[PDB]
Design a protein around this ligand. Structure first.
Ligand SMILES: NC(=O)c1ccc[n+]([C@@H]2O[C@H](COP(=O)([O-])OP(=O)(O)OC[C@H]3O[C@@H](n4cnc5c(N)ncnc54)[C@H](OP(=O)(O)O)[C@@H]3O)[C@@H](O)[C@H]2O)c1
Ligand SMILES: NC(=O)c1ccc[n+]([C@@H]2O[C@H](COP(=O)([O-])OP(=O)(O)OC[C@H]3O[C@@H](n4cnc5c(N)ncnc54)[C@H](OP(=O)(O)O)[C@@H]3O)[C@@H](O)[C@H]2O)c1
Ligand SMILES: C[C@]12CC[C@H]3[C@@H](CCC4=CC(=O)CC[C@@]43C)[C@@H]1CC[C@H]2O
Ligand SMILES: C[C@]12CC[C@H]3[C@@H](CCC4=CC(=O)CC[C@@]43C)[C@@H]1CC[C@H]2O
Lengths: 321, 321
């Protein structure tokens, strides 16, 4: 019942290694169920999902099954969900959380995040478009969205609340909000050796906000969300060399890198072998020279731009950080 | 319930912040009984002692007391004891552990360490001396001592075993020992901003050995163990400046420093105020720049030379590291 975790700025604890559940559309949802169960069996205690992934029914079932058969206790599973952009309006935040909880059949989520800062029109469609294919953007004061999130925490529906894909300006906007009750516990953003977020990371550290890295292994590289011409992280010569030296894998080196720099890292895999392999990140350590070697791979390569949401002022990736 | 721990190379888990129990000779033993109780209440889950500290009876009482009134469970207390140098002989190791356990009235210790690599003559006196006032050293093959330690772990008397005050050469001696069954899980050594052990730390990381830092706050400065004219760590301008900005203390900066470089840190305090303060190490973080600033304080200042044990082949502090 023991594993590595970090204390959040709201007193709760977050397991430093999380399991990602997002998969491509061409992948059946039944795969999420089997994958999450194998992840729990392997030793993952942190599970990351979201309403927009359209898999919470399956992920929730995996969790309930592992709890129901004695494999794990609810307090030993840290589950994260995310508020999708079609529910940024204050009065729609709690209903969105409650909808996810119903799909999951869980009483609460350990963490609820604002998934993306750009808002879209209310409704069932996650990406609402008009008759001419234009995304239907909505104007919403995120500070108001946050107050609705804070209320979800006070209601016990979400143990901790945080954000995702927020930049320096957006975080400051929340942190400088008059009457702020709860700082976000984290900022889940893309982070790997080719885009190490050094600057944003230091900022988060200075405010005791945990940076949670997604696409830590180089992302799924699926179109039209990621450009195929982008470099392949796991094929990097330095990572391959270090892997050989430590008798590990490029993926493990990339994951250990994050843990040693203070980042909570996610890792998605639907392959039984690789799922069990990623938990090996707690079996070795990198020296200072090796960590510096990895820092040197940084090359401003952002795999997930989500530019279909570019235009509105809240688009997060235009600023330096 | 939950707290920050690191996975050891034998599968067990060690809390990253430990409470030191060594106190000056001119300090009643009852002070340890009270201190440990407060440390446990403050949130310490890792307690560090040793046979040579002559306080295990009290430390044990404090622990069993907190377990008695339900303040904590045995499994949520990581207790460390150390084999003193008068019991390095193979046939004396288990008896020494059993003696510590009897004083503690505990069934097992979570960690048992070889306290210091230089051996002295068997007997009740911990620092036996001859007529001319010289220490009565003994000669013992540390590999034999280690094999005895391994048997203590297999017997269940110690969950994990490690070493303390070992240098590079001595660690390799154990790591390269024929028939090795268990690597040491840690090497507890002096470590702080004025002597950051970067080289030894990296070596340990390369072998997945956790470095545990003692005198992480500049030591007790008690003579004749420590030179009174030595620099005062907690009065360092950089640490003081960083402490001012973060609204903390120089001690907290020095402790946080260790946690972020992958070091498990000990903190001794018999003062209820400073005890509760040290636990605050989990409330903030240091940026890359602040860490670099602390790395710059390194100045080869070793407080505990234990030069009285100099001479034998195993004296550890003569080598570069
Ligand atoms: N909040 C956000 O905006 C956001 C955005 C993107 C992702 N995320 C979260 O982050 C999670 C992970 O990110 P991601 O989906 O971009 O992918 P990722 O973790 O970077 O991994 C990408 C690929 O790595 C492979 N892989 C996993 N372990 C491996 C190993 N040991 N060796 C070699 N390849 C390995 C996987 O393939 P196999 O499955 O075939 O093993 C997977 O397709 C997601 O599932 C989601 O929960 C959040
Ligand atoms: N294995 C070995 O060879 C070895 C050697 C030495 C020590 N150790 C272990 O390491 C533990 C700690 O090391 P240490 O005794 O050298 O001392 P330390 O932890 O470096 O601290 C030295 C002094 O710091 C003071 N202090 C504690 N917290 C403070 C705070 N927040 N602000 C200001 N001052 C503070 C304490 O005074 P107050 O008590 O008055 O608060 C104490 O006398 C020992 O008790 C022992 O368990 C192991
Ligand atoms: C890529 C990411 C996960 C996959 C989704 C995407 C938003 C649009 C989408 C709509 C869907 O119906 C399926 C999933 C997805 C393609 C998300 C933006 C942030 C990240 O979590
Ligand atoms: C300084 C240190 C802790 C205090 C002890 C010392 C060895 C001699 C001693 C004998 C005693 O009866 C009291 C404690 C102490 C003074 C230890 C050597 C390594 C370190 O743990």
């Amino acid at each position: 019942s023991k594993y590595q975790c970090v204390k959040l700025n709201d007193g709760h604890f977050m397991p430093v290694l999380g399991f990602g559940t997002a998969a491509p559309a061409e992948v059946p949802k039944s795969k999420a169920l089997e994958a999450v169960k194998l992840a729990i069996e392997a030793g993952f205690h942190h599970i990351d999902s979201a309403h927009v992934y359209n898999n919470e029914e399956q992920v929730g079932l995996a969790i309930r099954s592992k709890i129901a058969d004695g494999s794990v206790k609810r307090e030993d599973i840290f589950y994260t969900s995310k508020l999708w952009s079609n529910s940024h309006r204050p009065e729609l935040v709690r209903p969105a959380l409650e909808r996810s909880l119903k799909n999951l059949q869980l009483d609460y989520v350990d963490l609820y995040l604002i998934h993306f800062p750009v808002s879209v029109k209310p409704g069932e469609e996650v990406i609402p478009k008009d008759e001419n294919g234009k995304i239907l953007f909505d104007t919403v004061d995120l500070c108001a969205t946050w107050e609705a999130m804070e209320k979800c925490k006070d209601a016990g529906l979400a143990k901790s609340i945080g954000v995702s894909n927020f930049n320096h300006r957006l975080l400051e906007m929340i942190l400088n909000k008059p009457g702020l009750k709860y700082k976000p516990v984290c900022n889940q953003v893309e982070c790997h050796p080719y885009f190490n977020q050094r600057k944003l990371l230091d900022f988060c550290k200075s405010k005791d906000i945990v940076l949670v890295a997604y696409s830590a292994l180089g992302s799924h590289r699926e179109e039209p969300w990621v450009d195929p011409n982008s470099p392949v992280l796991l094929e990097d010569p330095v990572l391959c060399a270090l892997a050989k030296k430590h008798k590990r894998t490029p993926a493990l080196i990339a994951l250990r890198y994050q843990l040693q720099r203070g980042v909570v890292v996610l890792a998605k895999s639907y392959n039984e072998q690789r799922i069990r392999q990623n938990v090996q990140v707690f079996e070795f350590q990198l020296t200072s020279e090796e960590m510096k070697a990895i820092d040197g791979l940084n090359r401003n390569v952002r795999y997930l731009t989500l530019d279909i949401f570019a235009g509105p002022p809240n688009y997060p990736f235009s600023d330096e950080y």
